[PDB]
Design a binder for this molecule. Structure first.
Ligand SMILES: C/C(=C\CNc1ncnc2[nH]cnc12)CO
Ligand SMILES: C/C(=C\CNc1ncnc2[nH]cnc12)CO
Lengths: 266, 263
């Protein structure tokens, strides 16, 4: 009611929204760094070491025990690069056929594939699935290996849970990767892709829901990579259309842009 | 005077709080990644048989993930060796367990904690019995008894003589019961994943580069003993100051940051 109270009413919204934005950004950052460590893990213990020290069992165990290191991630998995020329050989050795993600059926002929060979049990259904048979995942895989850095997809509904989230992807390179490599060289030296599923719908709601004063505030997160086409990353809704605040978000991928919008319930 | 006194205070609080936050977050990040290393050793060295990790692999993985541990000068893994195992152990590694102070053959002890894995930045730790140093020894004991990360008091590290603190995680054998007793933890102890927080150098590099650093004096104290505050960072000096909170993760220890203006 009061006018001076309105000022403080905004100050509160600003503080609450900014804090929640910092928490989200930090938690995301922490998870990205540990996934990065997993990519290095696979490179060191699977490819560099002879013989490999990593099988599905080992990957499952280590990732499970370190799940607390990756908050906001529902699971991690490693997909290996497989060129069509190698497919038969790859499938005979693993004793299973590469499958599409849409139906889990034997994949048709493609130039290359990205089937998951290692997976955290939380996402064990990814095993043998070709990560390139999904458009979001395919684009992430390409940009990942071309840039040599972590990358994020647009928000989309994940496999099995259908939860709205985003996928994080790190490239894994063979030792043959030249220093100061070109994009062409990065592609030629690609071994595989370490991916993480950011279950935003479930895990972000869980983080926010526990915070004091949550019932009083409405929190929305947007992918604004495309100015004219903002994509809802999190949030549903009846709210206070008179006042709002925009908090800054940086999820680490220069190719994507995000922001948080907060309002009062009423 | 006088409204400037207020701003002068508000600036000190803000400057000190931010430095404290930065310091705590960096420490926290380093601790979490050392925890992952402890888990890594458990899985690859003990859960897998034969062992699927060695000095070569440890050195590579820790070097490549060095960025993950901002305030650590290096990390290493010391394995638990009881005396009756010493001959076999030394014969297997082809070296003798050495003392920390002189690097001489260790006298007979009930047990030892020789480093078998090391990041090349602390390669000199290899074969050294971490129990032959009091700070390290106590850290090792409290680590395996509590089952959680532990920190030492500030003390000068090997080789560099830089003032800092050691972080230690316990690594347990699979034979560790759940909801175990201290006696059970000790019996299941496999080794100790340790890291050296080079405060004197790395913290200085962290804070000394911040804008306005020349205007304020910054101290970090180990106040585990209120009557005997230990300097962890800053000079050895005893009006307008401010105390910023610090939580390094070890309930056994207490810390605080103190910021003050020069004039
Ligand atoms: C394995 C990798 C990505 C992981 N992607 C996903 N991980 C988990 N669920 C999903 N639904 C759609 N894509 C995913 C490699 O880039
Ligand atoms: C390997 C472990 C401790 C590491 N301790 C040290 N690590 C590095 N430099 C030092 N100087 C004195 N002690 C140290 C196990 O707790």
């Amino acid at each position: 009611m009061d006018d001076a109270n309105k000022i403080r009413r905004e100050e509160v919204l600003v503080s609450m929204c900014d804090q929640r934005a910092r928490m989200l950004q930090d938690q995301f950052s922490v998870s990205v760094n540990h996934v990065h460590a997993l990519a290095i893990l696979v490179s060191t213990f699977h490819y560099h070491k002879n013989p490999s020290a990593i099988d599905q069992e080992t990957f499952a165990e280590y990732t499970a025990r370190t799940a607390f290191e990756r908050p906001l991630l529902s699971g991690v998995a490693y997909a290996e690069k497989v060129v069509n020329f190698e497919r038969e050989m790859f499938e005979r050795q693993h004793n299973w056929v590469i499958k599409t993600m849409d139906r889990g059926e034997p994949s048709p002929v493609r130039d290359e594939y990205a089937p998951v060979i290692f997976s955290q049990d939380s996402v064990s259904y990814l095993e043998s699935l070709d990560m390139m048979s999904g458009e979001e995942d395919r684009e992430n895989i390409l940009r990942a290996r071309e840039t040599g850095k972590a990358v994020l997809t647009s928000p989309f509904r994940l496999l099995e849970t259908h939860h709205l989230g985003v996928v994080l992807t790190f490239p894994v390179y063979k030792s043959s990767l030249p220093e100061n490599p070109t994009v062409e060289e990065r592609i030629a030296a690609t071994a595989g892709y370490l991916g993480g599923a950011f279950d935003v719908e479930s895990l972000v709601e869980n983080l926010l829901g526990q915070l004091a004063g949550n019932q009083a505030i409405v929190v929305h997160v947007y992918d604004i990579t495309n100015a004219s086409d903002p994509l809802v990353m999190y949030g549903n809704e009846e709210a206070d259309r008179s006042l709002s605040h925009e908090s800054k978000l940086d999820f680490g991928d220069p190719f994507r842009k995000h922001k948080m919008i907060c309002r009062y319930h009423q």
